[PDB]
């Protein structure tokens, strides 16, 4: 039934994941991580918010493996699951920026997202009607590549949304005195195919990595092996992205 909603609407929310306290703790760890990488500078700082946070930070690694999220994603996609990317979407207080309706460009580099991919948008803060939250366009995922079917993604801190990658969406400005933080996770099955180029992903359910070179979890925040794997994987992914545009 979760899959029935997901397939008709192109999304499903709320999905329970973290408690309010888990969400607040993860937000603290995330802001600590951001301060740290801004202090280090360079490659980590540039790529702080995407696309492989889970490979260097423990809080991200811990969210993407959360059993509630993995169970829901399996409900939607099957028992074989990989983490393809992670993103921090942060709208700071009184952020006057808007985002037109659009589809995340990542879909273009993947073949099979139509039936074997989903993005989990975890709320680290609440998402209210005024703090610059995401808006879905119901049914807009059909045919892959309005304003009357817009649905505000309103979540308690710790809950998450799950949407098809062909889902149109927008964001308004954060009209409040508190920054809005969200963590997005791209989950795929081994039946998704990189349209062009070498790619890598992290096995989280099953034993089949498909066409993706297997990544591996950090033993420790910024463990040097994790840092090297991070450089390699982010360079790989950015070559892919550059190629598909
Ligand atoms: Ni987008």
TrEMBL record:
<dbReference type="GO" id="GO:0005506">
    <property type="term" value="F:iron ion binding"/>
</dbReference>
<protein>
    <recommendedName>
        <fullName>Phytanoyl-CoA dioxygenase</fullName>
    </recommendedName>
</protein>
<dbReference type="InterPro" id="IPR008775">
    <property type="entry name" value="Phytyl_CoA_dOase-like"/>
</dbReference>
<dbReference type="GO" id="GO:0016706">
    <property type="term" value="F:2-oxoglutarate-dependent dioxygenase activity"/>
</dbReference>
<dbReference type="Pfam" id="PF05721">
    <property type="entry name" value="PhyH"/>
</dbReference>
């Amino acid at each position: 039934d979760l899959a029935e909603r997901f397939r008709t609407d192109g999304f499903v929310f709320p999905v329970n994941a973290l408690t309010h306290a888990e969400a607040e703790q993860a937000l603290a760890e995330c802001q600590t991580y951001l301060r740290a990488v801004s202090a280090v500078g360079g490659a980590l700082a540039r790529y702080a918010a995407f696309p492989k946070i889970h490979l260097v930070a423990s809080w991200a690694d811990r969210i993407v493996h959360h059993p509630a999220i993995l169970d829901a994603v399996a409900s939607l996609l099957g028992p074989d699951l990989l983490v393809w990317s992670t993103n921090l979407f942060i709208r700071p207080a009184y952020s006057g920026s808007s985002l037109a309706w659009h589809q995340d460009a990542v879909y273009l580099g993947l073949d099979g997202y139509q039936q074997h991919a989903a993005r989990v948008w975890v709320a680290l803060t609440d998402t209210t009607i005024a703090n610059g939250t995401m808006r879905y366009a119901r049914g807009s995922h059909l045919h892959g590549a309005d304003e009357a079917a817009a649905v505000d993604v309103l979540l308690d801190a710790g809950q998450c949304s799950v949407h098809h990658l062909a889902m149109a969406h927008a964001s308004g400005p954060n009209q409040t005195d508190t920054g809005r933080f969200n963590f997005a996770i791209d989950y795929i099955t081994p039946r998704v195919s990189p349209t062009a180029g070498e790619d890598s992903a992290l096995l989280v359910r099953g034993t089949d990595t498909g066409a993706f070179l297997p990544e591996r979890r950090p033993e420790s925040d910024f463990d040097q092996a994790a840092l090297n794997d991070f450089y390699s994987a982010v360079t790989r992914r950015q070559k892919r992205i550059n190629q598909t545009v």
